[PDB]
Every structure is written in C-alpha cells, then in structure tokens.
C-alpha cells in the first residue's frame, strides 16, 4: 500500500491450488486488504486512517500474472469487482492512493 508519503508491505497466506491437504482458509482480495492493513469498514467501503482505499478510490497495479489471473476470474464471476478475486498465492497487488480525490 502506497499512501504517497509512506509505504506498508504485507504478506497474506494463500492456499496452494493443486493440493487436497492444504487447508489454508480462503479469503477474497477485499478481506485480505482489510486484514493486512486493519482498515475500517464504513458501511460498504474500506478506509485506511483517513483515506479511502476502496477499489474505486485507488489505482491498483499488478504484474502480468496477477492481472491475467484476476481477469480470467472476473470472467467466471458476477458482481464483477477486483476485491472479489480469491488471492491465489503469488499475487503482487500494489494499491496506490491518489494525490487528490473527489
């Protein structure tokens, strides 16, 4: 998470796919962003200290592989939000908070 003046880096445990004996619980990208940064939940949106870090209020950056995974899983999903993909063990999500926002 890059708020602009300070950066916060986190690792969140994700499950390995081709494995029956990997019982690491499943969470979405929104729940993982909420946990990793202890963000507050205002009704429906996700707030950092005093900044909105929801999917719309920030610019999301990924590498090629994470973007491809997120896209091909947005196809097979309804209610299409990036914060609903399921955090597949090797993602490189980079939230960037904008300078000015309305």
């Amino acid at each position: 998470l890059d708020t602009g003046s300070q950066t916060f880096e986190r690792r969140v445990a994700a499950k390995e796919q081709g494995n029956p004996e990997d019982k690491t619980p499943e969470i979405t990208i929104g729940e993982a962003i909420k946990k990793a940064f202890s963000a507050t939940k205002n009704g429906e949106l996700l707030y950092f200290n005093g900044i909105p870090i929801d999917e719309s209020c920030v610019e999301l950056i990924f590498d090629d592989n994470t973007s491809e995974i997120i896209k091909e899983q947005l196809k097979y999903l309804d209610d299409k939000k990036i914060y609903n993909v399921k955090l597949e063990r090797g993602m490189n999500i980079l939230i960037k908070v904008p300078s000015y926002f309305t």
Partner: protein
Amino acid sequence: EDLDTDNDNIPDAYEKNGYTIKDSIAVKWNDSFAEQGYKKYVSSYL
C-alpha cells in the same frame, strides 16, 4: 498392528505397494482418490 522396519511412521506394506498422506497420517492407496488430487508414493521399506 502393522510392521515398521525403518521407524518412519509408514508401514512396510504401504511403502512397497503404494500409499498417500491424509490428515498427516499415511493411508493405503485406494485408486479412486486420484481425482481428488491425491498422489501415490512408494519408497524403500528398509
């Protein structure tokens, strides 16, 4: 009881015939859970 010659928590008849690991316990290989993702290993029982 099942025999374990090399003392590594896998019975002798499992290491020579086929086994897999379920819930951190070695179980005999039944062929029907190859589509649950479970792989079948063999190793030296000595």
